[PDB]
Design a protein around this ligand. Sequence first.
Ligand SMILES: [Fe+3]
Ligand SMILES: [Fe+3]
Ligand SMILES: [Fe+3]
Ligand SMILES: [Fe+3]
Ligand SMILES: [Fe+3]
Ligand SMILES: [Fe+3]
Lengths: 168, 168, 168, 168, 168, 168
Amino acid sequence: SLARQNYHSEVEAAVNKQINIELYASYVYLSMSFYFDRDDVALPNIAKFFKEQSDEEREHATELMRVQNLRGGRVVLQDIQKPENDEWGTALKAFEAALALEKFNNESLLKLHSTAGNHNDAHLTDFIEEKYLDEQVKSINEFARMVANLKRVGPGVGEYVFDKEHFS
Amino acid sequence: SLARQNYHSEVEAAVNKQINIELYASYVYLSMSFYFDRDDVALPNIAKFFKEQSDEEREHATELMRVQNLRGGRVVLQDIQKPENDEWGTALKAFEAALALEKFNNESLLKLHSTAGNHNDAHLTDFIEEKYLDEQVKSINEFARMVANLKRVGPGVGEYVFDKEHFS
Amino acid sequence: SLARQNYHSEVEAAVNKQINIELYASYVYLSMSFYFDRDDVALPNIAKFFKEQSDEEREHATELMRVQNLRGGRVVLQDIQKPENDEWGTALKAFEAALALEKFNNESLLKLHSTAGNHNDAHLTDFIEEKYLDEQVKSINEFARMVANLKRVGPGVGEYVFDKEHFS
Amino acid sequence: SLARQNYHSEVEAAVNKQINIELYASYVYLSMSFYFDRDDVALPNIAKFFKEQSDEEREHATELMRVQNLRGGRVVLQDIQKPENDEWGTALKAFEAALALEKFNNESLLKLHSTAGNHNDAHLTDFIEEKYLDEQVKSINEFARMVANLKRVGPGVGEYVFDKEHFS
Amino acid sequence: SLARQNYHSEVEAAVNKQINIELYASYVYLSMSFYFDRDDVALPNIAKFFKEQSDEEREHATELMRVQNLRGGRVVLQDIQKPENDEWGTALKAFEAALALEKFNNESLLKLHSTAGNHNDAHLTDFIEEKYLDEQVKSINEFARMVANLKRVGPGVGEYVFDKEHFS
Amino acid sequence: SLARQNYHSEVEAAVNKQINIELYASYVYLSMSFYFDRDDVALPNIAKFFKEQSDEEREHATELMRVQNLRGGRVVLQDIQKPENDEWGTALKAFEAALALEKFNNESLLKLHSTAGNHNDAHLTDFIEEKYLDEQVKSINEFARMVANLKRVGPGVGEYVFDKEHFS
Ligand SMILES: [Fe+3]
Ligand SMILES: [Fe+3]
Ligand SMILES: [Fe+3]
Ligand SMILES: [Fe+3]
Ligand SMILES: [Fe+3]
Ligand SMILES: [Fe+3]
């Protein structure tokens, strides 16, 4: 690359690892979205919410691919593993699993930021701080509030009222 | 008929049978609609929904009459039997009976499609596949989702919330 | 019913009888509408007219069901008999049979009004007078004028001119 | 062709045969259109109708040429034979000859559909069913209704009234 | 499932297999899109085209998941394999590999249609014919035309002119 | 014909001959249009141009039929011969063959004008001069300019640039 400058190989490898992590999270959210679309579950606003989350994680992966091309590195793709479960239980269990996934993703992003800071890469630490860390903190807070409200309303008619009211 | 071509008599008889089946389904949905309009039941959005379903089944019967005239056959009408019940119980029992009626209608439509396929009638198999089979699959899925939500919300205030929220 | 007041059982039975009469008239007009849609008859404006008449008779039956629920009675449905003929001859014969059907319906409505008057039911006699008797008189007059014009124009080109001009 | 897949040579030959049949039908309708434009016949709306029918048959032939190029086959054109008659008699005789031509075309289309079904060509059977069979059934029904109305109105002033009224 | 009717398990397994095939094709097109985004390749309209193709294949996979839920089956997801190459050579080699991928996908779709036809599943054969087969034929034709034009213009300034002109 | 005046039979026969010549030219241009639509040729603007030329030649033939009916003659149609080639080579060879066809048509039109002038038919010589001769001269000039530009740009990328630029 004629454009490559102050971009070490360890940082390039860590960016490729984060790309695979974002693609796996997108595929997990797609699985959850079509679990709540089943005819014996039938909570359509929750399914639409998880479909939007899947699209957002795919956008995160493509923006990391774009900055990898911008700095003069090379994108190397790996296999995307299938999700851990085919069915996700009640709505409370699914939102708790989603919260755990968001926290795992936040820990991976902080490790990537630490590697880029150790190799004195100012542009990439600023990129990560501007586009990923604040969005991840807000996503974790949103899922924690939804878990608290699902614990409040309880099963049955509270779950129906939550599906009708929380996403409009 | 000057227009009749590749239209056997068995297919004509099966089309007349399907016309009577659609008219019976319309009259059953009219009975359900005015059961939920009673002053001691008083669920108006469910009653409006079943009135719309009755109008839709009448439209299905008239479109079958129109294609019978289009192919050069002759419409032969029979008696329309009264519905099996005068009162339909709770909302869950009524929607379960409606789901069973939709599945019976789907089985009759598949038998008509099989007869038209056995007599090498390409236009009528394409007509049935385009206008009836996909609509019937979507109707069965809609009634199954409504049965699942009525099992979720339970009786009483859940039934009131279902009547207020599900059809708007 | 908590709402029932000054509504005797004989009046309720007569209202159910009138409901079945209106549904039978709707099904007769549907048969006439699809007779004139045949490819060897081919008078489309007459067929559209009889389709509108069928929809109107269905509306009459549903309004009687609504007032039965309003007064606190219970709707009891019966079988709908098939029409007397499959084919209706010339246009003059069909309009004469339609005129005879309208006069039969008017005689049934007058008998219902007489029963409600004998049982001192002021609301139902006023309902019948405001919604059914004047409309029935106007319908009989319209069919008599159409029979007179069909006798005037004669068969053939007069029938074609009648179909093109009378309903626009 | 780099695009050819699951497209046998017998199906290609049958598509070329159907192209020639549609072009012949277009040229027959052009002959009828300019017969009714003569100064001793002078029925202008019938002539305009047959001109539109000629344009429609030319569109059918060009859409078959387009799907032949789409599947990777090669278009092979043949001579277009002249129509059987120079003059077409009365309006009733011309519309009866047009009805016979439409039924011949429908029989050829059903034979093409049968060949494509015997060679397990799913895309072409769906193409024929979607774009040609229903349109052909509707065209045959339209010509049969016009023959019935021309028999009704008779010669002379009925023919003039038919030309003035039926196409507006 | 309360909605499942005339839906055998072999057809369900074949639908899950086709879902995995569409997801793999989407990931291959994403790899091609970010190959042409590199700073030493720099053909931006080709990269935008392959990004749109990746989004379209993802939409195909989600519509198959939706019809699997509609018929009462259960979605079972598998691993998505990484693409065969990291870099795709010249533009002609990349479009030839894309054409081969589209033809492989068409062969898989025809096998799925054959299985659904062997198990007498009328709704699913009509669904596949309406939504997938014609689109696949048009996609194969589009890629074959692009391969022919890339062979015509040659390398260098012809490749630049192709990137500037073909997608606007 | 009541309208025929100063219209000899030789002029009528020459008009019928010119009608057949225009229809043959239309069918040749249709063959060229679908040659350039092939997936291994793929020059879409040239194909659209030849489709428009085919429609224009059909309009020329129908206007000659109209003036034949206007003067009180009778249209007599003949067979339309198939074109000389199924495939037309490069773009330069196809445009050279089109130029030769236009010059043949111009020679036939001048012979028709000479016959009408020899029989002292003032209206038809004015008709031919106003509607056919100037249009034919402009068409020959347009095809000669396109042959000169196709010789200028050469094969390959020049042919691609010609297809992209010359018709917009
Ligand atoms: Fe993310
Ligand atoms: Fe129905
Ligand atoms: Fe009435
Ligand atoms: Fe046609
Ligand atoms: Fe796809
Ligand atoms: Fe010309």
